[PDB]
Structure 1
Amino acid sequence: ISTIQPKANFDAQQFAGTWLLVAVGSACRFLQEQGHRAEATTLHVAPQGTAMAVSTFRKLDGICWQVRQLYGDTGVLGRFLLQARDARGAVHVVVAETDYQSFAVLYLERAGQLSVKLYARSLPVSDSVLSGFEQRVQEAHLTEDQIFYFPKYGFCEAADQFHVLDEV
């Protein structure tokens, strides 16, 4: 197992706001067997230090939800530990390829297994960006069939109080 380099001179004061989920590269059996009836999903990001401050917004069975999180940093710029907030423990988190105007690609790892995510800052995504992300999926040693593509419509933000998790 080996670690990719993060985005050089990344900055959470400039990489910020919304990011609509395009797709996820992962080997995990959940997306293979449960993965049907998937949900519209987006990241939302703000500065607090070297560590990113983050939310995910998502629908669950037609009700909108928010996952608040802090990406506590590893001492390396653009590398984080997900603050180990539950018994699954830490997740290694990285920003790997991006331009803050149009797209972001993230790597996430736990229990020795790599996974990757593609985002665009608005509804559409370029096929050149999607082709570059498939190389990041192949650098995660995954196939394009282990890419799962998420709802290109029906995104949500600003959920009510009882639909934010407060995980931090």
Structure 2
Amino acid sequence: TIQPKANFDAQQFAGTWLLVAVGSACRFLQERAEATTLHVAPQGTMAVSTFRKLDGICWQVRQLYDTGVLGRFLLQRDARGAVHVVVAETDYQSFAVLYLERAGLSVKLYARSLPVSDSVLSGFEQRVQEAHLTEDQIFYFPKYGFCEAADQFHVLDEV
């Protein structure tokens, strides 16, 4: 249903993205968010490191995003559902809207820098409303306290 950006360029999408907000009917998110950063490299044509804290300690998660459209990716785990990631809208240079669909969906807003513009923000809220999510269900992530690195004992490597 959600289309990826037409002609999605993995090369320009590379680098560091800051998690701004997530739209979601996730039970977890509605019941302390952490500053979250994504580090993206194409591997073939995407390797994805998330850095964020858990109980005051920085972790690096390594994942892989590879099915044959462009902004559509397969994430695999343990007995989890597979996740489809769609890079729906981005300008490569300031913002990005990613959709993650397990079974029955979250919409994430990332930026290259903060603050995000009014127009990027409105557009995201519009998508969230169109994913049948309410403004209640938009959770904004912190703007400080990012993890610049995780040591070798605090890498969760799913690759």
Structure 1: segments with no counterpart, 5+ residues: none
**Distance in 2 separating the partners of 1:89 and 1:135:** 27
CA separation of 1:134/1:116 partners in 2, compared to 1, >3 Å: closer, same or farther? same
Unaligned runs of 5+ in 2: none
Q: In the aligned structure 1, how far is the partner of 2:109 from the partner of 2:38?
A: 11
Aligned-pair identity in percent equals 100
The alpha carbon displacement at 1:74 in A equals 2.2
Name the residue aligned to 2:153. 162
- C-alpha distance in 2, partners of 1:135/1:16? 26
| TM-superposition CA deviations, 1:85-124 (whole Å, max 9, x none) | 2211301111001111110110001121x21000110232
TM-score (norm 1): 0.90
Structure 2: distance between partners of 1:12 and 1:65: 25
Asked whether the 8 Å contact 2:10–2:42 carries over to 1, the reply is yes
What whole-Å deviation, never above 9, does each CA across 1:14-42 have from its counterpart, x for those lacking one?
A: 11111011010000111111xxx211111
How far apart are residue 49 of structure 1 and its match?
Answer: 2.2
Q: Deviations over 1:37-96 (max 9, x none)?
A: 21111111001123x11111101111111110001x22211111202x221130111100
- TM-superposed CA distance for 1:158, in Å, is 2.0
CA RMSD of aligned residues (A): 1.1
Aligned positions, number: 159
| Separation (CA, whole Å) in 1 of partners of 2:55 and 2:118 | 30
Give, in whole Å, the separation in 2 of the partners of 1:96 and 1:152.
23
**Equivalent position SS for 2:133:** coil
Which among 20, 36, 61 is matched to residue 55 of structure 2? 61
Return the alpha-carbon distance in structure 2 between the equivalents of residues 137 and 49 of structure 1: 31
Structure 1 consecutive aligned stretches of length 4 or more whose deviation exceeds 2 Å: none
1:135, distance to aligned residue in structure 2 (A): 1.3
